[PDB]
Protein backbone atom coordinates (compact mmCIF):
# COMPACT_ATOMS: atom_id res chain seq x y z
CA UNK A 1 0.00 0.00 0.00
CA UNK A 2 0.98 3.64 -0.54
CA UNK A 3 2.53 5.18 2.59
CA UNK A 4 4.00 8.58 3.36
CA UNK A 5 5.95 8.57 6.63
CA UNK A 6 7.03 11.85 8.17
CA UNK A 7 9.78 12.57 10.69
CA UNK A 8 8.97 13.05 14.39
CA UNK A 9 7.76 16.06 16.37
CA UNK A 10 10.19 18.98 16.76
CA UNK A 11 10.61 21.49 19.57
CA UNK A 12 12.82 24.40 18.57
CA UNK A 13 13.91 27.94 19.49
CA UNK A 14 13.52 31.00 17.23
CA UNK A 15 16.49 31.40 14.87
CA UNK A 16 17.31 27.69 14.71
CA UNK A 17 17.35 25.80 11.41
CA UNK A 18 15.18 22.75 10.75
CA UNK A 19 14.67 20.24 7.96
CA UNK A 20 11.74 17.84 8.28
CA UNK A 21 11.24 14.79 6.04
CA UNK A 22 8.60 12.73 4.23
CA UNK A 23 9.44 9.24 2.92
CA UNK A 24 7.28 7.55 0.31
CA UNK A 25 6.87 3.80 -0.09
CA UNK A 26 4.58 1.37 -1.90
CA UNK A 27 4.74 3.33 -5.17
CA UNK A 28 7.13 4.96 -7.66
CA UNK A 29 8.30 8.01 -5.70
CA UNK A 30 9.74 9.66 -8.81
CA UNK A 31 6.41 9.35 -10.68
CA UNK A 32 4.32 11.65 -8.42
CA UNK A 33 4.48 15.19 -7.07
CA UNK A 34 4.67 15.70 -3.29
CA UNK A 35 2.97 18.70 -1.69
CA UNK A 36 3.50 20.35 1.68
CA UNK A 37 0.61 21.71 3.75
CA UNK A 38 0.70 23.85 6.92
CA UNK A 39 -1.93 23.72 9.65
CA UNK A 40 -1.45 26.24 12.47
CA UNK A 41 -3.03 25.45 15.88
CA UNK A 42 -6.84 25.47 15.61
CA UNK A 43 -6.62 26.76 12.02
CA UNK A 44 -7.28 25.41 8.51
CA UNK A 45 -5.09 23.86 5.82
CA UNK A 46 -2.59 26.00 3.89
CA UNK A 47 -0.84 25.01 0.68
CA UNK A 48 2.93 25.63 0.92
CA UNK A 49 4.32 24.20 -2.29
CA UNK A 50 5.02 21.11 -4.34
CA UNK A 51 7.99 19.14 -5.71
CA UNK A 52 8.47 16.50 -8.41
CA UNK A 53 11.11 14.19 -6.83
CA UNK A 54 12.22 12.92 -10.28
CA UNK A 55 13.85 16.24 -11.26
CA UNK A 56 13.24 18.54 -8.24
CA UNK A 57 10.93 20.86 -10.20
CA UNK A 58 9.55 22.94 -7.32
CA UNK A 59 6.65 25.39 -7.10
CA UNK A 60 5.83 27.51 -4.04
CA UNK A 61 2.61 29.06 -2.83
CA UNK A 62 2.99 32.88 -3.02
CA UNK A 63 2.80 33.19 0.79
CA UNK A 64 5.69 30.73 1.27
CA UNK A 65 7.95 31.72 -1.62
CA UNK A 66 11.32 32.66 -0.07
CA UNK A 67 10.18 31.61 3.43
CA UNK A 68 10.96 27.86 3.20
CA UNK A 69 12.93 25.51 0.99
CA UNK A 70 11.32 22.38 -0.43
CA UNK A 71 13.65 19.69 -1.75
CA UNK A 72 13.99 15.96 -2.39
CA UNK A 73 16.48 13.13 -2.33
CA UNK A 74 15.12 10.60 -4.81
CA UNK A 75 17.87 8.09 -3.91
CA UNK A 76 16.14 7.56 -0.53
CA UNK A 77 12.56 8.32 -1.68
CA UNK A 78 12.41 11.36 0.59
CA UNK A 79 10.99 14.87 0.26
CA UNK A 80 11.96 17.72 2.60
CA UNK A 81 10.73 21.02 3.99
CA UNK A 82 13.30 23.31 5.60
CA UNK A 83 13.73 26.65 7.38
CA UNK A 84 17.02 28.51 7.82
CA UNK A 85 15.76 30.57 10.79
CA UNK A 86 12.57 29.52 12.58
CA UNK A 87 10.05 31.96 14.06
CA UNK A 88 7.52 31.30 16.83
CA UNK A 89 4.88 31.85 14.12
CA UNK A 90 6.12 28.69 12.33
CA UNK A 91 4.50 26.64 15.14
CA UNK A 92 2.17 24.27 13.28
CA UNK A 93 1.41 20.78 12.05
CA UNK A 94 3.06 20.09 8.69
CA UNK A 95 1.71 17.47 6.29
CA UNK A 96 3.16 16.05 3.15
CA UNK A 97 0.75 14.60 0.59
CA UNK A 98 0.93 12.83 -2.75
CA UNK A 99 -0.54 14.76 -5.67
CA UNK A 100 -2.79 12.75 -8.01
CA UNK A 101 -4.80 16.87 -9.01
CA UNK A 102 -6.25 16.21 -5.57
CA UNK A 103 -4.19 14.97 -2.60
CA UNK A 104 -4.88 11.24 -2.44
CA UNK A 105 -2.45 10.02 0.25
CA UNK A 106 -1.25 11.99 3.26
CA UNK A 107 1.59 11.71 5.75
CA UNK A 108 0.75 11.47 9.45
CA UNK A 109 1.99 15.03 10.07
CA UNK A 110 5.00 16.52 11.83
CA UNK A 111 4.31 18.86 14.74
CA UNK A 112 6.77 21.74 14.93
CA UNK A 113 6.74 23.89 18.07
CA UNK A 114 8.90 27.03 18.08
CA UNK A 115 9.29 29.02 21.30
CA UNK A 116 11.82 31.03 23.28
CA UNK A 117 10.72 28.97 26.33
CA UNK A 118 12.95 26.23 27.77
CA UNK A 119 12.09 22.78 29.14
CA UNK A 120 10.37 23.03 32.55
CA UNK A 121 8.49 20.48 34.66
CA UNK A 122 5.08 21.38 36.11
CA UNK A 123 3.93 22.10 39.63
CA UNK A 124 0.75 20.19 40.51
CA UNK A 125 -1.80 21.92 42.73
CA UNK A 126 -5.04 20.49 44.12
CA UNK A 127 -8.49 21.56 43.01
CA UNK A 128 -10.03 20.60 46.34
CA UNK A 129 -13.64 19.52 46.85
CA UNK A 130 -15.67 21.62 49.32
CA UNK A 131 -24.76 14.98 45.87
CA UNK A 132 -22.12 15.36 43.16
CA UNK A 133 -18.74 16.88 44.00
CA UNK A 134 -15.96 17.96 41.67
CA UNK A 135 -12.24 17.73 42.39
CA UNK A 136 -9.11 17.95 40.28
CA UNK A 137 -5.50 18.91 39.68
CA UNK A 138 -3.98 22.05 38.22
CA UNK A 139 -0.82 21.22 36.26
CA UNK A 140 0.92 24.57 36.01
CA UNK A 141 3.96 26.15 34.34
CA UNK A 142 5.49 23.46 32.12
CA UNK A 143 7.12 23.33 28.69
CA UNK A 144 6.78 21.77 26.12
CA UNK A 145 3.55 19.86 25.71
CA UNK A 146 2.44 17.20 26.45
CA UNK A 147 1.63 15.93 29.93
CA UNK A 148 -0.27 12.75 30.77
CA UNK A 149 -2.82 12.68 33.59
CA UNK A 150 -4.53 9.66 35.11
CA UNK A 151 -6.59 9.20 38.28
CA UNK A 152 -5.90 6.46 40.84
CA UNK A 153 -3.32 4.92 38.47
CA UNK A 154 -5.99 4.32 35.81
CA UNK A 155 -8.59 2.83 38.19
CA UNK A 156 -10.72 6.00 37.95
CA UNK A 157 -11.89 6.95 34.44
CA UNK A 158 -15.62 7.68 34.76
CA UNK A 159 -16.42 11.40 34.85
CA UNK A 160 -12.81 12.48 34.23
CA UNK A 161 -12.22 15.54 32.04
CA UNK A 162 -8.64 16.44 31.17
CA UNK A 163 -8.65 19.81 29.42
CA UNK A 164 -6.54 21.21 26.58
CA UNK A 165 -3.58 23.16 27.95
CA UNK A 166 -3.51 26.95 27.70
CA UNK A 167 -0.35 28.84 26.78
CA UNK A 168 0.36 31.62 29.26
CA UNK A 169 2.18 34.90 28.47
CA UNK A 170 5.23 33.42 30.24
CA UNK A 171 5.55 30.89 27.41
CA UNK A 172 4.64 28.07 29.82
CA UNK A 173 1.57 25.83 29.59
CA UNK A 174 -1.12 25.22 32.22
CA UNK A 175 -3.65 22.39 32.20
CA UNK A 176 -6.45 21.17 34.47
CA UNK A 177 -7.87 17.69 35.00
CA UNK A 178 -11.11 17.20 36.91
CA UNK A 179 -13.42 14.38 37.99
CA UNK A 180 -16.95 14.39 39.39
CA UNK A 181 -17.65 11.87 42.16
CA UNK A 182 -20.35 11.19 44.78
CA UNK A 183 -20.18 13.71 47.65
CA UNK A 184 -20.57 10.72 50.00
CA UNK A 185 -17.26 9.24 48.78
CA UNK A 186 -15.20 12.26 49.89
CA UNK A 187 -14.59 10.89 53.40
CA UNK A 188 -13.69 7.34 52.37
CA UNK A 189 -12.30 7.15 48.81
CA UNK A 190 -8.73 8.29 48.07
CA UNK A 191 -8.29 10.42 44.95
CA UNK A 192 -4.81 10.84 43.47
CA UNK A 193 -3.94 12.44 40.14
CA UNK A 194 -0.92 10.96 38.40
CA UNK A 195 0.90 13.52 36.28
CA UNK A 196 3.84 12.83 33.96
CA UNK A 197 5.85 15.33 31.95
CA UNK A 198 8.30 13.24 29.93
CA UNK A 199 10.33 16.12 28.43
CA UNK A 200 11.57 17.24 31.89
CA UNK A 201 11.44 13.79 33.52
CA UNK A 202 8.91 15.17 36.04
CA UNK A 203 6.42 12.66 37.47
CA UNK A 204 4.05 13.75 40.26
CA UNK A 205 1.26 12.15 42.31
CA UNK A 206 -1.08 14.56 44.08
CA UNK A 207 -3.62 13.35 46.62
CA UNK A 208 -6.66 15.63 46.50
CA UNK A 209 -9.05 15.90 49.46
CA UNK A 210 -11.25 18.46 51.26
CA UNK A 211 -9.07 21.16 52.87
Amino acid sequence: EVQLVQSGAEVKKPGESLKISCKGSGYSFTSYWIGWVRQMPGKGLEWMGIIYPGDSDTRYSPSFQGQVTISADKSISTAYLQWSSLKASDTAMYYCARYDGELDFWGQGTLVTVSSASTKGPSVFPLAPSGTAALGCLVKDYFPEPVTVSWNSGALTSGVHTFPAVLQSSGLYSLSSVVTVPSSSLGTQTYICNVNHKPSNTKVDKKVEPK
Binding site: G101, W106, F125, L127, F163
Partner: protein, 213 residues
Protein backbone atom coordinates in the same frame (compact mmCIF):
# COMPACT_ATOMS: atom_id res chain seq x y z
CA UNK B 1 -5.78 32.98 -7.11
CA UNK B 2 -9.11 31.23 -6.43
CA UNK B 3 -10.46 31.89 -2.93
CA UNK B 4 -12.75 29.21 -1.49
CA UNK B 5 -15.30 30.18 1.16
CA UNK B 6 -17.05 27.48 3.15
CA UNK B 7 -20.37 27.82 4.96
CA UNK B 8 -21.57 27.44 7.58
CA UNK B 9 -18.58 27.66 9.96
CA UNK B 10 -20.25 25.09 12.19
CA UNK B 11 -23.07 22.71 11.31
CA UNK B 12 -24.95 21.27 14.29
CA UNK B 13 -27.03 18.20 13.44
CA UNK B 14 -28.32 15.01 15.03
CA UNK B 15 -27.23 11.57 13.77
CA UNK B 16 -29.59 10.53 10.95
CA UNK B 17 -30.02 14.07 9.64
CA UNK B 18 -28.77 15.21 6.23
CA UNK B 19 -25.69 17.44 6.29
CA UNK B 20 -25.28 19.98 3.49
CA UNK B 21 -21.89 21.72 3.36
CA UNK B 22 -21.21 24.65 1.02
CA UNK B 23 -18.03 25.72 -0.80
CA UNK B 24 -18.12 28.92 -2.88
CA UNK B 25 -15.28 29.89 -5.23
CA UNK B 26 -14.26 33.45 -6.17
CA UNK B 27 -14.39 32.44 -9.86
CA UNK B 28 -15.57 29.40 -11.83
CA UNK B 29 -13.76 26.11 -11.20
CA UNK B 30 -14.16 23.07 -13.46
CA UNK B 31 -15.94 20.29 -11.54
CA UNK B 32 -12.99 18.00 -12.44
CA UNK B 33 -10.79 19.92 -10.00
CA UNK B 34 -12.78 20.29 -6.76
CA UNK B 35 -12.09 17.95 -3.82
CA UNK B 36 -13.29 17.44 -0.25
CA UNK B 37 -11.33 16.21 2.78
CA UNK B 38 -12.39 14.96 6.20
CA UNK B 39 -10.25 15.64 9.28
CA UNK B 40 -10.73 14.20 12.76
CA UNK B 41 -8.87 15.64 15.79
CA UNK B 42 -5.27 14.42 16.02
CA UNK B 43 -5.51 12.93 12.52
CA UNK B 44 -4.34 13.78 9.02
CA UNK B 45 -6.90 14.91 6.45
CA UNK B 46 -8.46 12.12 4.37
CA UNK B 47 -9.66 12.46 0.76
CA UNK B 48 -13.46 12.00 0.57
CA UNK B 49 -14.58 13.31 -2.81
CA UNK B 50 -12.58 14.18 -5.95
CA UNK B 51 -13.72 15.71 -9.26
CA UNK B 52 -16.60 17.38 -7.35
CA UNK B 53 -18.73 14.21 -7.23
CA UNK B 54 -16.57 11.03 -7.19
CA UNK B 55 -16.06 9.04 -3.98
CA UNK B 56 -12.50 8.21 -2.96
CA UNK B 57 -11.55 4.59 -2.24
CA UNK B 58 -13.12 3.32 0.99
CA UNK B 59 -15.66 6.16 1.29
CA UNK B 60 -19.27 5.07 2.03
CA UNK B 61 -22.23 5.82 -0.26
CA UNK B 62 -23.79 8.39 2.09
CA UNK B 63 -21.10 10.89 1.03
CA UNK B 64 -21.83 12.71 -2.23
CA UNK B 65 -20.82 15.93 -3.95
CA UNK B 66 -22.32 18.21 -6.57
CA UNK B 67 -21.79 21.60 -8.16
CA UNK B 68 -20.10 23.56 -10.93
CA UNK B 69 -19.05 27.14 -11.72
CA UNK B 70 -18.64 28.87 -8.36
CA UNK B 71 -20.91 26.76 -6.14
CA UNK B 72 -20.23 23.30 -4.72
CA UNK B 73 -21.75 21.09 -2.03
CA UNK B 74 -20.76 18.08 0.01
CA UNK B 75 -23.74 16.03 1.17
CA UNK B 76 -23.85 13.44 3.93
CA UNK B 77 -27.30 11.92 3.34
CA UNK B 78 -27.77 10.52 6.88
CA UNK B 79 -25.15 11.34 9.54
CA UNK B 80 -23.36 8.55 11.41
CA UNK B 81 -21.44 9.18 14.70
CA UNK B 82 -18.08 8.78 12.88
CA UNK B 83 -18.99 11.58 10.41
CA UNK B 84 -18.74 14.35 12.99
CA UNK B 85 -15.50 16.04 12.00
CA UNK B 86 -14.07 18.99 10.09
CA UNK B 87 -14.45 19.15 6.30
CA UNK B 88 -12.35 21.15 3.82
CA UNK B 89 -12.90 21.84 0.16
CA UNK B 90 -9.95 22.28 -2.19
CA UNK B 91 -9.45 23.36 -5.79
CA UNK B 92 -6.63 22.02 -8.00
CA UNK B 93 -7.54 23.41 -11.43
CA UNK B 94 -5.63 26.68 -11.49
CA UNK B 95 -2.45 27.24 -9.49
CA UNK B 96 -1.91 28.10 -6.75
CA UNK B 97 -3.77 25.19 -5.11
CA UNK B 98 -6.17 26.54 -2.45
CA UNK B 99 -8.31 25.25 0.44
CA UNK B 100 -11.52 26.51 2.03
CA UNK B 101 -11.35 27.48 5.70
CA UNK B 102 -13.28 24.41 6.88
CA UNK B 103 -16.69 23.52 8.29
CA UNK B 104 -17.05 21.67 11.59
CA UNK B 105 -19.91 19.18 11.80
CA UNK B 106 -20.83 18.63 15.46
CA UNK B 107 -23.61 16.72 17.21
CA UNK B 108 -26.81 18.56 18.04
CA UNK B 109 -28.43 17.28 21.23
CA UNK B 110 -30.94 18.72 23.71
CA UNK B 111 -29.76 21.89 25.47
CA UNK B 112 -28.10 21.03 28.79
CA UNK B 113 -27.08 23.58 31.42
CA UNK B 114 -23.57 23.34 32.91
CA UNK B 115 -22.98 22.24 36.47
CA UNK B 116 -20.68 24.91 37.91
CA UNK B 117 -17.84 24.50 40.44
CA UNK B 118 -15.30 27.00 41.82
CA UNK B 119 -11.87 26.18 43.28
CA UNK B 120 -9.74 28.52 45.42
CA UNK B 121 -5.95 28.60 44.94
CA UNK B 122 -3.96 26.16 47.08
CA UNK B 123 -1.78 27.35 49.97
CA UNK B 124 1.18 25.70 48.22
CA UNK B 125 0.71 27.83 45.12
CA UNK B 126 0.28 31.04 47.13
CA UNK B 127 3.75 30.47 48.63
CA UNK B 128 5.22 30.96 45.12
CA UNK B 129 3.61 34.40 44.65
CA UNK B 130 0.77 33.58 42.24
CA UNK B 131 -2.88 32.65 42.74
CA UNK B 132 -4.84 30.58 40.23
CA UNK B 133 -8.62 30.47 40.76
CA UNK B 134 -10.40 27.80 38.69
CA UNK B 135 -14.00 27.53 37.49
CA UNK B 136 -15.40 24.33 35.98
CA UNK B 137 -18.49 24.22 33.76
CA UNK B 138 -19.38 20.56 33.44
CA UNK B 139 -21.33 18.62 30.80
CA UNK B 140 -23.25 21.29 28.88
CA UNK B 141 -24.66 21.83 25.39
CA UNK B 142 -24.31 23.89 23.16
CA UNK B 143 -20.60 24.76 23.25
CA UNK B 144 -21.13 28.54 23.59
CA UNK B 145 -20.76 29.65 27.21
CA UNK B 146 -19.66 32.76 29.06
CA UNK B 147 -17.57 32.85 32.22
CA UNK B 148 -17.45 36.18 34.04
CA UNK B 149 -14.97 36.36 36.89
CA UNK B 150 -15.71 38.84 39.68
CA UNK B 151 -13.49 39.95 42.56
CA UNK B 152 -15.31 41.99 45.25
CA UNK B 153 -17.96 42.60 42.54
CA UNK B 154 -15.43 44.02 40.05
CA UNK B 155 -15.79 42.30 36.65
CA UNK B 156 -12.45 40.83 35.59
CA UNK B 157 -11.27 40.93 31.99
CA UNK B 158 -7.95 40.01 30.36
CA UNK B 159 -6.57 38.04 33.33
CA UNK B 160 -8.21 34.69 32.53
CA UNK B 161 -7.77 31.81 30.10
CA UNK B 162 -10.09 28.93 29.28
CA UNK B 163 -10.30 25.74 27.28
CA UNK B 164 -13.03 23.32 26.24
CA UNK B 165 -13.00 19.53 25.85
CA UNK B 166 -13.93 17.79 22.61
CA UNK B 167 -17.59 16.81 22.38
CA UNK B 168 -18.16 13.78 24.64
CA UNK B 169 -18.51 10.47 22.75
CA UNK B 170 -21.26 9.15 25.07
CA UNK B 171 -23.43 12.17 25.96
CA UNK B 172 -22.43 14.74 23.29
CA UNK B 173 -21.74 17.49 25.85
CA UNK B 174 -18.80 19.83 26.40
CA UNK B 175 -16.96 20.88 29.53
CA UNK B 176 -15.02 24.08 30.12
CA UNK B 177 -12.26 25.05 32.53
CA UNK B 178 -11.41 28.69 33.19
CA UNK B 179 -8.46 29.98 35.23
CA UNK B 180 -8.28 33.45 36.77
CA UNK B 181 -4.64 34.29 37.51
CA UNK B 182 -3.61 37.08 39.86
CA UNK B 183 -0.59 37.90 42.02
CA UNK B 184 -0.54 36.67 45.62
CA UNK B 185 -0.54 40.35 46.64
CA UNK B 186 -3.72 41.08 44.66
CA UNK B 187 -5.39 37.88 45.87
CA UNK B 188 -4.77 38.72 49.54
CA UNK B 189 -6.13 42.28 49.08
CA UNK B 190 -9.61 41.07 48.15
CA UNK B 191 -12.31 38.88 49.74
CA UNK B 192 -15.06 37.57 47.45
CA UNK B 193 -14.13 35.48 44.40
CA UNK B 194 -16.94 34.61 42.04
CA UNK B 195 -17.49 32.78 38.77
CA UNK B 196 -20.70 33.89 37.02
CA UNK B 197 -21.80 31.57 34.21
CA UNK B 198 -24.12 32.45 31.32
CA UNK B 199 -25.40 29.73 28.97
CA UNK B 200 -28.42 29.03 26.72
CA UNK B 201 -29.66 26.38 29.17
CA UNK B 202 -29.61 28.62 32.25
CA UNK B 203 -32.76 30.69 32.86
CA UNK B 204 -30.54 33.14 34.75
CA UNK B 205 -26.76 33.31 35.31
CA UNK B 206 -25.33 30.88 37.89
CA UNK B 207 -22.72 32.26 40.29
CA UNK B 208 -20.42 30.12 42.42
CA UNK B 209 -18.28 31.97 44.94
CA UNK B 210 -16.00 31.74 47.96
CA UNK B 211 -14.64 34.16 50.54
CA UNK B 212 -10.85 34.06 50.80
CA UNK B 213 -9.81 32.28 54.01
Amino acid sequence: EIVLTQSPGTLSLSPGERATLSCRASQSVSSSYLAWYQQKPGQAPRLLIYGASSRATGIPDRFSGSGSGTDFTLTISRLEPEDFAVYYCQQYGSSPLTFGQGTKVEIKRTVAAPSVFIFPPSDEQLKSGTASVVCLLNNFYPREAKVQWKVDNALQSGNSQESVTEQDSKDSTYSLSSTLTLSKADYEKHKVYACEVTHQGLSSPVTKSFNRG
